[PDB]
Nucleic acid binder design. Structure first.
Lengths: 107, 108, 95, 97, 180, 82, 106, 98, 80, 97, 109
DNA sequence: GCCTGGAGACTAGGGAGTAATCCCCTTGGCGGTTAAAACGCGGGGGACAGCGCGTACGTGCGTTTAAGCGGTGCTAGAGCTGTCTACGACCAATTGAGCGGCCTCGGCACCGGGATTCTGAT
DNA sequence: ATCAGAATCCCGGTGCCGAGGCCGCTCAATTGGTCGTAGACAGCTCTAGCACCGCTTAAACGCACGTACGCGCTGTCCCCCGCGTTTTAACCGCCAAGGGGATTACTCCCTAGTCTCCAGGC
């Protein structure tokens, strides 16, 4: 009953390759590796929920969208993203952005 | 930038702390914890028809992906406003983390 | 069952006797139906509570009269009691 | 140009909306609010039209009565503008809070 | 007169026969929205031509948002082609267009109160409920939306011809209640 | 700008509700306070109505469910069934 | 021949239906004969009173059809019925046109 | 000079004392005589059980204490300390008693 | 009669002290006597109605509790 | 003569008291208050279950109606723990004879 | 015939399941009453009694007493928010009020 | 002419009406006496009126946008109906749990005296 | 800060009455069996609730600007609070008498239950 959404993230990607390298070595059992990944997902969710303060806006064309299994998948084109560091707005022009979403609480 | 690095350090510390108890519960020595954390830190530092979308794969470092939660979605004919939450984004080999975002999209 | 239950016919008869050339909206009909049901439920509940307080098992004219006195304000209670006793007297006389 | 004296248009709206019977909240945002609130209790709930209309009638009645009490207790403080402390006082006396 | 209405939205229906497993359709196809609990259908849209396909469980699909009727059938052809690409084999049958909507502007102020008074039994006007008056006609069965600005909405027509006579019929009545 | 559903109870709507209540002058924080109060009231009444619905093993909230929810709290409502 | 109980009592409300609702409504194991007659008379009187005041309100607004606004005026203008229905909301009824004296212009 | 306490010190001491205690604050014979005079208007030659008058007194004192709490709250709302009858009238109006 | 004056100025002052009141105006006493008289007339009216329904001439404690219960002032401590 | 029996929840309240507080006693007036509280909550839940059975055109009061009436009257935490205790008791009673 | 066992003992309750069942049957609430309804209701009554009695015993300990008086029940009820919500319209005889003085009335320096 | 509650007749059982009794409890009176109410006074501090200032709120105007309308789709789900079976009413015999009465002793209350705290003037 | 007086808190002693336990009894709860019917469940129908479109237009919103008003400050005077003295009536106890509430027993009328006709609505 807990979201597997943040596995694809770069931080998550780094963890999955590191566990895979460890499993290849054989230092630990695979079920434990799954357990660690689940813990990572839970910890990352709460820290994102509270420990971040940055504000940003996406202005762009919408190439494709999808909504299946309570997952919203937006492909956004020529985005004008303005991000401010916590410690000024910075304009970045990005050709393509993939938005993967999920409802706060799933039923 | 700075904020993303600091938050990433909180994730690293918190996860490494929490994980050890299950490792010890099943007979895994504390050396593995250090090994996983150091190699993991090193990789983060170094790394920083048309209709059918079934044939979709992670392009690589170049692609830009948003993993986030959606508060609610609004429906308009041209505009496609959508409120998003708890998202980590990677654009131009840089990591930007946010709690909430607003995306406005255009239906061509 | 498909058939339902409403007080509309009686309310219409009362409306004609009181004001012959006035209609009533359907929404106002739903309001009057819910008003009659709510006042009936209040009076019947108070009368049932009354019969339970006195260890009785029957709802009589006395329990309905006392529940009318208790729930209805003084002028309304006095005139509703007069109406009820007049109706009970007429009903018993004709048997 | 000519500008209406302050408080005349407020009284005009008071007389207008106290003479009327229409609903003062737009039906679609109120329906969206109702569905959002209802989601927290039971998921995949459908709502009858008349149910949302009854909810809106009750909400507007409750808020109009609260505003009446708020105005009375703001006049009691020898004021005209109503502040949230007036609402908190009215609710506290009513027993809502 | 000197005005001809322009068709904007065509509402068409197509049945496909075999029952569909919507989950595969939602996953494979793009521009699709399938919330099963709220609605038992997937909402699908294609950029060119702009249309909205609602694909249901029994196989019946509803295409709307089409400027023309040939454009509507062409859009249905595109939807059928892509659904064939999804992996479900179905044959198009019983194509029919039940409703088309037409927008025209007379470009001259009209008085709604006179029209309401003249046709009070025939038609109903309610200012607070709507700033326009609905106009129901026994023959042709075309609902008419009338406005103070003079924008006339034509709806309820199986074919274009039916709205065209209905607009022609309404034009003298609109001229009668002209302002100044 | 996209707003929360609770913000869908717009400032003019609250001002009309105040005008019907006789409120000549409204502060700026009355709107947020009224949105919070209305959210609390709606939460209570919709929770009671959804409980009434779940007892009947229905998936649709009926107007009679809302009427029975309101009636128990003494905020009776006429016009949607008795 | 059969005569309805309402005509015997001299009422328009159905004594039989009120008796059925009392017997089936789980108020007591037994219901007296005079109770539905009395209750129907009280309900009919209250209906006649409310409808009389609503018809007066409708005539005041130059209407020939009772709408919820006239029911609200009938309830909230009479003091006894406002005490009776003080916790009751009437849908599409609005409020009484009352403005506080302090807010009136100087 | 004799010893004197500044105004409001003893009022607060009474507030703490009577909020700490639970006895009835109205004398029982005056309240009983008031109850019987009022009951003379409904039925003549009425008799009252002792526990009935005690229940009436507990209910009356609790009602008056809650009313004075609301009266004090709406007096403080007007940036005041002294309660006037308009405070009582406001509290009874808001509660739906007028 | 003079019995309403039996609700003395110190008794009303003590009731206000339990309510948390620090200063009392001279007219609170007459206002409170009027409020208490209205409340007592309501409760005793309902209680005598309950008594008369039971064909009794004595107001029992159950009459007072029952009367308070339908005015929403449920009282614990006197039975029922 | 001998006074007719007047049933009360005094001994049951005293048993529950000796369970939660084995050394704490209770006065007679506090016992009368607890008896009034048990009677009041009993008649509230029973009236709500009666109205609940009447609304759904049913004629039996079961654990379903009592459970829904507990969810209705009692506050959320109280309702959750009362439903848990009632469900546990009905389960244990159905498991036995 | 086997030895009689009380319904409360079967349910593991102290409150009387049989008396609650008879009161539900005689109370004119429905023509029929389920078997698990008095069990459920007796469990709910026992739980609410246990909550108030535990809080009242705590209040009596706080006043260095070993008997529960109406004051302790009043303190227990009005000090818990949920129970005060449940008994908002309820008056507890000889209970007093909660010690509560508004901060504006306190003296100043 | 075809019906779904309603009226008519009849029976049987029990609930309510009525009459006598008893004893509880309410009502009425006397007296002491003491604490509480009433009354006078003076002072201070708070209610209240006036002023003043800046500020936030009303008003208007142009812009935007979403609420409302109308229509159509379909299918989930409300509603209704038939059938059967588990489950609750009922009844009778039994008997232990719960209540009335009685006793007794400890928690609490009353008194009094020292210790602590708090308030106000210095 | 300080100090003295007044009020409250705490500690101990004595008493007293009410709560807690025991016993006896009786009646309501329990157990076992029967039976009738409500409710569960499956199956069929068909309504309306949740999507989509687009048009229109009045309503929301953002902002500019000015001004009524809220809130802070100041002065005044009046009336509420603290306290001391006097008066009074509430409270406790004690007694007495009789009304009336509760109980029991007998009767009889009144309402549920059932069956059969029926009468307004269609």
């Amino acid at each position: 009953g807990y979201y597997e959404l943040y596995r694809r993230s770069t931080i998550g990607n780094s963890l999955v390759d590191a566990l895979d390298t460890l499993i290849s070595d054989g230092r630990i059992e695979a079920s434990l590796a799954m357990r660690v990944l689940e813990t990572f997902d839970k910890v990352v969710a709460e820290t994102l929920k509270d420990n971040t303060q940055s504000k940003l806006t996406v202005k762009g064309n919408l190439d494709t969208y999808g909504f299946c299994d309570d997952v919203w998948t937006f492909i956004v084109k020529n985005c004008q993203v303005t991000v401010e560091d916590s410690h000024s707005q910075s304009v970045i022009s990005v050709d393509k952005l993939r938005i993967v979403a999920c409802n706060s609480k799933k039923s | 930038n700075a904020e993303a690095s600091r938050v990433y350090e909180i994730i690293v510390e918190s996860v490494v702390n929490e994980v050890r108890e299950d490792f010890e519960n099943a007979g895994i020595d504390e050396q593995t914890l250090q090994d996983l954390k150091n190699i993991w830190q090193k990789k983060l530092t170094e790394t920083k028809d048309d209709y059918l979308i079934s044939e979709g794969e992670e392009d690589g470092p170049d692609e830009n992906l948003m993993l986030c939660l959606y508060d609610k979605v609004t429906r308009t004919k041209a505009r496609w406003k959508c409120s998003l939450k708890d998202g980590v984004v990677t654009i131009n080999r840089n990591d930007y983390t946010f709690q909430k975002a607003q995306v406005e999209a255009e239906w061509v | 069952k498909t058939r339902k239950e409403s007080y509309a016919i009686y309310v219409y008869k009362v409306l004609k006797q009181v004001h012959p050339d006035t209609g009533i909206s359907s929404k106002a009909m739903s309001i009057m139906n819910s008003f009659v049901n709510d006042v009936f439920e209040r009076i019947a509940g108070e009368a049932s509570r009354l019969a339970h307080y006195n260890k009785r098992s029957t709802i009589t004219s006395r329990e309905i009269q006392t529940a009318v006195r208790l729930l209805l304000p003084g002028e309304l209670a006095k005139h509703a009691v007069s109406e009820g006793t007049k109706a009970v007297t007429k009903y018993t006389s004709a048997k | 140009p000519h500008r209406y004296r302050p408080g005349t248009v407020a009284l005009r709206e008071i007389r207008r909306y106290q003479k009327s019977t229409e609903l003062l909240i737009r039906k679609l945002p109120f329906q969206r609010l109702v569905r959002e609130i209802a989601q927290d209790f039971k998921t995949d709930l459908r709502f009858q039209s008349s149910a949302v209309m009854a909810l809106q009638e009750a909400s507007e009645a409750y808020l109009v009565a609260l505003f009446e009490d708020t105005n009375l207790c703001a006049i009691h403080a020898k004021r005209v503008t109503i502040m949230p402390k007036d609402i908190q006082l009215a609710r506290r006396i009513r027993g809502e809070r | 007169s000197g005005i001809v209405p322009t068709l904007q939205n065509i509402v068409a229906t197509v049945t496909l026969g075999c029952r569909l497993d919507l989950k595969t359709v939602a996953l494979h196809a793009r521009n699709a929205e399938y919330n099963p609990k709220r609605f038992a259908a997937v909402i699908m849209r294609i950029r060119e031509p702009k249309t909205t396909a609602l694909i249901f469980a029994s196989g019946k699909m509803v295409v709307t948002g089409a400027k023309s009727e040939d454009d509507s059938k062409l859009a249905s052809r595109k939807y059928a082609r892509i659904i064939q690409k999804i992996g479900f084999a179905a044959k198009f049958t019983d194509f029919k267009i039940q409703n088309i909507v037409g927008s025209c502007d007379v470009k001259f102020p009209i008085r709604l109160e006179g029209l309401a008074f003249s046709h009070g039994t025939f038609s109903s006007y309610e200012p607070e409920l709507f700033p326009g008056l609905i106009y129901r006609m026994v023959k042709p069965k075309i609902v008419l939306l009338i406005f103070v600005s003079g924008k006339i909405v034509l709806t309820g027509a199986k074919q274009r011809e039916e709205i065209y006579q209905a607009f022609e019929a309404i034009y003298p009545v609109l001229s009668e209640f002209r302002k100044m | 700008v996209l707003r929360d559903n609770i913000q869908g109870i717009t400032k003019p709507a609250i001002r009309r509700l105040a005008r019907r209540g006789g409120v000549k002058r409204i502060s700026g924080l009355i709107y947020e306070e009224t949105r919070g109060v209305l959210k609390v009231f709606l939460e209570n009444v919709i929770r009671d109505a959804v409980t009434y619905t779940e007892h009947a093993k229905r998936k649709t909230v009926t107007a009679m469910d809302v009427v029975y929810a309101l009636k128990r709290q003494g905020r009776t409502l006429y016009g949607f069934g008795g | 021949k059969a005569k309805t109980r309402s005509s015997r009592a001299g009422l328009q409300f159905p004594v039989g239906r009120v008796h059925r609702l009392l017997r089936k409504g789980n108020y007591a194991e037994r219901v007296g004969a005079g109770a539905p007659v009395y209750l129907a008379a009280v309900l009919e009187y209250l209906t006649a009173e409310i409808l009389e005041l609503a018809g007066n309100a409708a005539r005041d607004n130059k209407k020939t059809r009772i709408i919820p606004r006239h029911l609200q005026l009938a309830v909230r203008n009479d003091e006894e019925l406002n005490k009776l229905l003080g916790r009751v909301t009437i849908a599409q009824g609005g409020v009484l046109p009352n403005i506080q004296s302090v807010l009136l212009p100087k």
